[PDB]
Structure 1
């Protein structure tokens, strides 16, 4: 809800796919369509207004030396239209629009190859036990469960107490705790 708290929320309440998108956006001051879509709708879902969204996406896109006016002429329409599509679910994310080079959207558990997923989780300081467990699930295609496991670890609880199927559900479940 607070535009200047997104950096921290990334760390605690965003599932790995949205945390990645927020990261990629802050470092590259830009995201391709796949991710503007996934992360954009997700931010809407967590309750950002249309005013904050434009100020969020415009502000970051300008840090990339992008002509402020070019932004309104080539981006802002879709932000605004978004606020009058449905936030992506895990299956939609897992099953559609497979990320390519330069893309950062998708499901980390389903789209990152095993070794890169490992490194990523290691950068999030997940225990070596937890990382091993996730690698077992992922090999079995139990993506959403690996994500629940990740949820349980960064929250320090034994059972998330919910069957995951939506990035926004993860953020909610998360917020109910912290």
Structure 2
């Protein structure tokens, strides 16, 4: 669909369907005009999964890395992004990451936005985000209980149900949310 493009992915109509990890990656990208490696990978493969074309992805990434010149973007990042679309080397059209894959990556440190917020954020940070999403105190306690147990995809599924099958892939969360929209 032509509805998913370099500009629409920043709009509320599309972004309201993102799970917490993708919202966190978009926030880091908008604040810093950049993402570190694992965040570039997690977000670019998710956007490929929602239908962002290779041409639109290059527009998205070059526009989002707003503070560098197009020549620096082309020298330093274009190959990596094209490679994610199966346009380089062996031309493997890499699949988007599921939660299992996301969780397997090195844990995020200072300045990183990849990973899973249900594992990576403090209960203080999660509670504030869930309050902003209109969840009640009882609902927040239920989500945090799943987090404490290490059941991140269950916490994420609870947030999906509370804000709208077990979800264990950010692209499935997006697709299910978009179909209900």
Cα distance per residue 1:13-67 (max 9 Å; x no partner): 11100011111111111110110000010000001100110000101102xx212
**Secondary structure in 1 matching 2:58:** helix
2:33 matched residue in structure 1: 29
1:75 matched residue in structure 2: 77
Cα distance per residue 1:96-120 (max 9 Å; x no partner): 2210110011000011122222222
| 2:49 matches 1:45 | yes
Give the 5 Å matches for 1:1-178: 1-7=4-10, 8=12, 9-10=14-15, 12-62=16-66, 65-84=67-86, 85-155=94-164, 162-178=165-181
Cα separation, 2, equivalents of 1:123 and 1:147: 16
* Cα root mean square deviation, aligned: 1.3
Please report how far the alpha carbon of residue 121 of structure 1 lies from its aligned counterpart in structure 2 after TM superposition.
Answer: 2.1
1:159 matched residue in structure 2: none
Cα separation, 1, equivalents of 2:160 and 2:118: 13
Cα separation, 2, equivalents of 1:27 and 1:122: 22
Instruction: Tell me the TM-score normalized by structure 2.
Output: 0.88
Q: Which runs of 5+ in 1 are unaligned?
A: 156-161
Q: Which runs of 5+ in 2 are unaligned?
A: 87-93
**Secondary structure in 1 matching 2:139:** helix
Please report how far the alpha carbon of residue 150 of structure 1 lies from its aligned counterpart in structure 2 after TM superposition.
Answer: 0.6
Please report how far the alpha carbon of residue 132 of structure 1 lies from its aligned counterpart in structure 2 after TM superposition.
Answer: 1.3
Instruction: Tell me the TM-score normalized by structure 1.
Output: 0.90
CA contact (8 A) 2:167 2:173 kept: yes
CA contact (8 A) 2:25 2:43 kept: yes
Cα separation, 2, equivalents of 1:83 and 1:152: 32
Cα separation, 2, equivalents of 1:48 and 1:17: 18
